[PDB]
Write a protein that holds these residues in place. Structure first.
Motif, short mmCIF file in Angstrom:
data_model
loop_
_atom_site.label_atom_id
_atom_site.label_comp_id
_atom_site.label_asym_id
_atom_site.label_seq_id
_atom_site.Cartn_x
_atom_site.Cartn_y
_atom_site.Cartn_z
N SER A 167 -7.44 -14.97 4.34
CA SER A 167 -7.54 -13.77 5.17
C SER A 167 -8.98 -13.28 5.26
O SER A 167 -9.45 -12.90 6.34
CB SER A 167 -6.64 -12.67 4.62
OG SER A 167 -6.60 -11.57 5.50
N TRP A 173 4.71 -2.89 -2.15
CA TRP A 173 4.51 -3.41 -0.81
C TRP A 173 5.69 -4.27 -0.36
O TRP A 173 6.27 -5.01 -1.14
CB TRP A 173 3.21 -4.21 -0.74
CG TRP A 173 2.05 -3.34 -0.43
CD1 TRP A 173 1.22 -2.73 -1.31
CD2 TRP A 173 1.60 -2.96 0.87
NE1 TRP A 173 0.28 -1.99 -0.65
CE2 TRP A 173 0.48 -2.12 0.70
CE3 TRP A 173 2.02 -3.25 2.17
CZ2 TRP A 173 -0.21 -1.57 1.76
CZ3 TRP A 173 1.33 -2.71 3.23
CH2 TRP A 173 0.23 -1.88 3.02
N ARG A 174 6.03 -4.15 0.93
CA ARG A 174 7.23 -4.78 1.45
C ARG A 174 7.16 -6.30 1.33
O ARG A 174 8.09 -6.93 0.82
CB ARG A 174 7.45 -4.36 2.90
CG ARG A 174 8.77 -4.83 3.48
CD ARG A 174 9.01 -4.25 4.86
NE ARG A 174 8.11 -4.84 5.85
CZ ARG A 174 8.42 -5.90 6.59
NH1 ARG A 174 9.60 -6.49 6.45
NH2 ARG A 174 7.55 -6.37 7.47
N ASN A 175 6.07 -6.90 1.81
CA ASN A 175 5.85 -8.32 1.65
C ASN A 175 4.36 -8.57 1.47
O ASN A 175 3.53 -7.75 1.87
CB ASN A 175 6.42 -9.12 2.82
CG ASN A 175 5.86 -8.70 4.15
OD1 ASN A 175 4.66 -8.78 4.39
ND2 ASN A 175 6.73 -8.26 5.04
N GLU A 176 4.03 -9.71 0.87
CA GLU A 176 2.65 -9.97 0.47
C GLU A 176 1.73 -10.14 1.67
O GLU A 176 0.55 -9.80 1.60
CB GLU A 176 2.58 -11.20 -0.41
CG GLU A 176 3.05 -11.00 -1.83
CD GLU A 176 2.66 -12.15 -2.73
OE1 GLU A 176 2.94 -12.09 -3.94
OE2 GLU A 176 2.06 -13.12 -2.22
N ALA A 177 2.24 -10.69 2.77
CA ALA A 177 1.38 -10.91 3.93
C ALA A 177 0.84 -9.59 4.48
O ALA A 177 -0.35 -9.49 4.81
CB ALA A 177 2.15 -11.66 5.02
N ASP A 178 1.69 -8.58 4.56
CA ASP A 178 1.25 -7.27 5.03
C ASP A 178 0.24 -6.65 4.07
O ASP A 178 -0.76 -6.06 4.50
CB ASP A 178 2.45 -6.35 5.21
CG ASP A 178 3.11 -6.52 6.56
OD1 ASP A 178 2.83 -7.53 7.24
OD2 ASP A 178 3.91 -5.64 6.96
N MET A 179 0.49 -6.77 2.76
CA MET A 179 -0.45 -6.23 1.79
C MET A 179 -1.81 -6.90 1.89
O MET A 179 -2.84 -6.23 1.82
CB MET A 179 0.09 -6.41 0.37
CG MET A 179 -0.77 -5.75 -0.69
SD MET A 179 -0.83 -6.73 -2.19
CE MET A 179 0.91 -6.83 -2.55
N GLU A 237 -3.10 -8.45 4.52
CA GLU A 237 -3.75 -8.01 5.76
C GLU A 237 -4.35 -6.63 5.60
O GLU A 237 -5.46 -6.37 6.07
CB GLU A 237 -2.75 -8.04 6.91
CG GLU A 237 -3.25 -7.34 8.17
CD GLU A 237 -4.09 -8.24 9.06
OE1 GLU A 237 -4.54 -9.31 8.59
OE2 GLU A 237 -4.29 -7.89 10.24
N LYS A 238 -3.64 -5.72 4.92
CA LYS A 238 -4.17 -4.38 4.69
C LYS A 238 -5.42 -4.42 3.82
O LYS A 238 -6.40 -3.72 4.09
CB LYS A 238 -3.10 -3.50 4.05
CG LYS A 238 -3.54 -2.09 3.78
CD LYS A 238 -3.63 -1.28 5.06
CE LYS A 238 -3.43 0.19 4.78
NZ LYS A 238 -4.39 0.70 3.76
N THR A 289 -8.31 -5.74 5.87
CA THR A 289 -8.77 -4.73 6.82
C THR A 289 -9.59 -3.66 6.12
O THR A 289 -10.61 -3.22 6.65
CB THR A 289 -7.58 -4.11 7.54
OG1 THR A 289 -6.85 -5.13 8.22
CG2 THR A 289 -8.05 -3.08 8.54
#
Lengths: 516, 520, 516
Positions: free
Chosen positions: C23, C145-151, C153-154, C157
């Motif tokens: 990422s 966190w709901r899932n690792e991909a979103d975490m 990405e956050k 960012t």
């Protein structure tokens, strides 16, 4: 009712049901409110009938939902009404795992076992069949949701969204004569040939192409796996498109975002539509297409949409359809006199086809409207709420000047013409309305290139030639005779103006400031 | 003083962060309150110091007290900080006793006491003292008991209303404080609304442009909308609607989509057919205001029949054209009237000098500019604002500039109303403004009869509130006549195939004859 | 470096660190990559210095982060660099509770106890002080966190957002003479008086009002609790605002959404700004205000902004400032000749104040530019990359016609004038450039109402009167003399045109098609 809420009083009445009902109230949803008719007795009627006459059912499952034969009976009735009547049942698992409900284990299972003592076998079987059917249907889980306020807002939004789309459209019942249109279309669509057939609908402006397309969409789209309707493509396409590729790419982006339900789509190349739609039946309606580039952007080959697909292009000029190779083309026709009168009476007497005693003036105004549904709608709306003397007093202006609601659209269709096409339109309006095309060529042929002009005019459906005689709709000839007072005709470069206005030539002929 | 947050909520997240604190926060957000939310603490920053600084900079502290409140150390530390800041900085502390009583809080007995004992084992000697004294201090406050309410939505509404009142106690004035003489308007509207009749009356409000139909609608909404189940106000419907309107159905669907997205709190609706408002608003007391309709498509999209709405509903359409209201069968119409001379001076002085009365020495020239402004509130506002900071000589040498040029902010609006007419109505308007202002209707019909249909034109102009016929003579507002005389210099009057123009002026337009360049 | 990642190899290298690095790579972030210099030895230098020279530090804490003295030493060094150097340390708790790290209990505590055997007291104390400092700083928790991909990405960012705003602005070092402006402003702002003082900046178009406002914002805003800058309010405000209240409400919505960081704001009444800002120090910059209504929308009373607030209105006409009662007004002044030359040499010789041997032509073009920073920038940019012969060949056109980049702005400021004000502007340009105002009144007084005209012109800063003599900037007089070829002057209604063009009057005087 709007919603029938099934719940357990001792668990959720104080805490969460209050918030849910408040959200429903602020969203305009009114649920059934039991007055505690029988707190621990049988449900009886007027509680079975309340379930029967509820558009949506909401089951709110908690740890003690099974410790009350009242709630179990309500659930069994709810699922029975879901199977037979086709009710919509939404489940909310409040601090209960769906697995514990399906298999009736855990604390829910303990409560259900305690309840089912002394009850007969058939009652228990109905209860547990209902329970295991409930546990499978997709609902909302309290444990998964971040906080209760967000979950409740989501539930309220979903219930509101279903209540919005619960009933089918009925605003199209006010239309007159759609059966002829649908019967002419289904001959062309041939919905059983599993090709990627592309159909074109063409006609004068304001004849009903858009309404026909919308009606056809509403009838058929549910047969198709993935469908979308693009409205007014001509309007949303920039005329000075200095970089046409960008406009083409965003047009395909619009189509694709509307169709495959991914509103957050940004695409790179123009072949994304092929990639997405090659393996799914698609019903796509492109409305008001004006030029080839945007057809190429949206639907360029039948290879793109895959089997059983139907692409329907409603347009105003035939040259666009011929260029893109459509071949199956529908020429929309003017409605019969009785249907024309029904349309006028919709728009003038408030959705009432019988005349209200104004039959005499109603037919004169109708005849003034030609046959266009646009002209009929405009003239009828311009006269609704009037009294008969008001009708006679409005009539002369309505006769010596067409309404701007019609003039604007005819002008927009008249601004896409070459100057010689405009001049031929004016000549046909003022002098040669119903004349043999050969004589028109013999008279205007030295300077107008009439043979190409008539071709273009007929293709744009601003004229029709029948039995070797040209014919223009009266509601276009009026626009022409009006335009012939503020616009000129240049042959080489000399400016000539047609003189046809009744009682308007007298004062111009009694003049000294002229040009001969 | 200076604060950074209105409300700081102190809680124990393991008990209330999911269930009740979420509802409290959503209610606060709906009531226009900005609380401190620990989830938005900027990352890579120490939590303890940010919590301290947020407690210190919050005006109101709210303490949710769960039975596991004393189990955490963050909770007790921030409670001690809240008590110290209340005693030392004058911040307001509110308590909520969620399923525990102050008796246990203030003595650490059994429930909520065992958590304190287990959390206080390994500590210092004075930290325990500070935490305890904070506990007795907070428990002596009177707050909200969860077990005294039958449902929690009502309790949360009560808490949010109390906090909103406590924060909004300044309230020196509302946006509707500079309005002049609108008790008269609201009395006349009340006779038409008849709010205890449980019918579905639709009420029209018609007047010339710039008579404040929009301000009357806004005031009436903010006064009456409270007592209806659902309510919405839609402003400037005339401007958002497409002008050529090549597709009526899509525009109507979009307009009803807006109406339902605002009436129903569903912020993102996608209406599929014009029948949704029928099926969602048929059993509800509904108050709906349609601020500026121009044509009947808007009405058919928004309010077609009184059957679309439920018993007691009121629908209020403000308009400039009476034909639109008559076509829809309204029959309850309020014709807005110009404010009296005294109230007109009050409006002009409010916009010019900032007060209802003029500054010393300004009275004569102020009243002259007033008389120039006609009586329209729009003209009074524009001319008053055009002279807000100036002094006497500027007034005296700008008045001749006011007389000889219509202001842009009035001309543009009158132009927008004028561009909606037909060609013959425009020509009749120009004739009346330039030549036949106060003359007889009969004489105007006799003179202009051959050029155009005078009688129907006058009827339509009166429908549109551009003229007025009182005793067989026609009339125009001074501002409308000024606009017409200005546009006479650029507009051509096409009668047949010919073309004409009008010469109106004092002495200035007599030199146009000496041009010797343009056809006469 | 960009980022220094601290982690435990055996826990996260295979699974999550790979995704995090991917990422970062796709976001353009390049982290330090240790080559396994010493897998189980001391850190040493070039691993201490790598931590020292990293803009961001990322600690990724897992169950065995404490079972390696390597990672513990890295963490202690990271926190030391966070305290002294002021490094930015972001924590990621991968399947570890922060509480278990702060108190070193659980499996993390077991590992840390096992590591700390045989180690001296000071080392253990440094390790645990670092640990308890780390556990408190606000990071990302895997469990929440709901899932690792979103975490991930956050996290990426956020790191990108800090790297974007790591350094202060330096593009304003290319400006010349800002010290005079800031010194004149701080006399007016008086930042220690804790009032709600409102300051006005006024000047001719293209003199530097916007740049001065931006520089002042960048210097001061950090002193203020809540600050925002509204740019080009004149441009974003519709001229035909038929419903002014709606425009006012959306303008205040824009201001409020920009300021209090709630981008999703929709407000009902116009008194929301008072409600929000009454109790907080606010630094608000309103730029290019043209009329009172929008001042009322944004800042109408000093009661609205609360103590220590500063509202700065940059405008072009003084009447607006006087109407709203500002009183503290700054009249921006033209820069000195040497600073003018420095600006021109920035814009013509590539950020190089010394002339590159083109000193002769550079001064002629400067003198042609008057003193406006706008004129200097336009003229300099129009000549960069040229050679000296190219300069001489461009010069005559640059002298007989001002660039459109200046003309467009001057026209926009010249389209807001009454017709008599335009006529007085033209007269002052062509004939009365530096004349006693009394004689101008004696000459044009019979028809121009000069005394109001000069007043309005001076208030709009299209003229300045010094020692009883009118003066217009040369770069405006050129616009005037240009305009005097395509625009007329009507006195009653007769059209007169000023004749001042050099070598342009010869051909007009040698004519028969004239008007006298």
């Amino acid at each position: 009712h709007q919603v029938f809420p099934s719940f357990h009083g001792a668990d959720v009445r104080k805490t969460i049901l209050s918030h849910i009902l408040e959200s429903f109230r602020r969203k305009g949803i009114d649920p059934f409110i039991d007055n505690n008719i029988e707190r621990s007795k049988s449900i009886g009627h007027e509680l079975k009938e309340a379930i029967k006459g509820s558009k949506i059912a909401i089951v709110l499952l908690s740890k003690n939902y099974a410790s009350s034969s009242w709630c179990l009976d309500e659930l069994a009735e709810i699922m029975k009404c879901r199977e037979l009547l086709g009710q919509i049942v939404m489940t909310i698992f409040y601090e209960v795992d769906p697995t514990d409900i399906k298999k009736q284990t855990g604390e829910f299972g303990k409560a259900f076992t305690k309840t089912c003592k002394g009850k007969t076998k058939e009652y228990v079987e109905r209860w547990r069949k209902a329970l295991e059917d409930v546990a499978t249907i997709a609902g909302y889980h309290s444990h998964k949701w971040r906080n209760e306020a967000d979950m409740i807002e989501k539930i309220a939004t979903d219930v509101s969204n279903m209540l919005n789309s619960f009933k089918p459209s009925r605003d199209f019942n006010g239309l007159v004569g759609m059966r002829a249109h649908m019967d002419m279309l289904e001959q062309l669509l041939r919905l059983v040939l599993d090709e990627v057939r592309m159909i074109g609908i063409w006609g004068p402006p304001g004849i009903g192409k858009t309404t026909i397309a919308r009606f056809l969409f509403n009838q058929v789209s549910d047969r198709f796996q993935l469908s979308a309707i693009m409205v007014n493509i001509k309007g949303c396409y920039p005329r000075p498109c200095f970089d046409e590729y960008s406009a083409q790419l965003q047009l395909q982006n619009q189509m694709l975002s509307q169709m495959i339900n991914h509103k957050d789509i940004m695409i790179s190349h123009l072949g994304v539509a092929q990639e997405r739609l090659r393996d799914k039946k698609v019903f796509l309606v492109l409305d008001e297409v004006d030029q080839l580039g945007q057809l190429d952007a949206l639907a360029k080959e039948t290879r793109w949409f895959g089997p059983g697909s139907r692409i329907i292009i409603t347009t105003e000029d035939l040259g666009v359809l011929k260029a893109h190779g459509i071949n199956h083309v529908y020429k929309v026709g003017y409605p019969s006199n009785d249907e024309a009168f029904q349309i006028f009476c919709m728009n003038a007497f408030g959705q009432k086809q019988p005349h209200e005693g104004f039959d005499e003036i109603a037919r004169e105004v109708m005849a003034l409207a030609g046959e266009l549904p646009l002209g009929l709608k405009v003239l009828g709306s311009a006269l609704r709420g009037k009294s008969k003397p008001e009708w006679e007093r409005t009539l002369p202006r309505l006769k010596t000047s067409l309404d701007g609601k019609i003039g604007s659209i005819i002008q927009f269709s008249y601004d896409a013409l070459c100057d010689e096409d405009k001049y031929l339109f004016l000549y046909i309006a003022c002098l040669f309305n119903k004349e043999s095309t050969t004589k028109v060529e013999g008279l205007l042929g030295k300077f107008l290139d009439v043979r190409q002009g008539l071709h273009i005019l007929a293709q744009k459906s601003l004229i029709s030639i029948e039995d070797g005689n040209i014919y223009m709709h009266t509601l276009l000839e009026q626009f022409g005779r009006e335009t012939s007072r503020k616009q000129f005709i240049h042959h080489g470069y000399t400016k000539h103006q047609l003189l046809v206005g009744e009682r308007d030539i007298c004062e111009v002929l009694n003049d000294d400031t002229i040009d001969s």
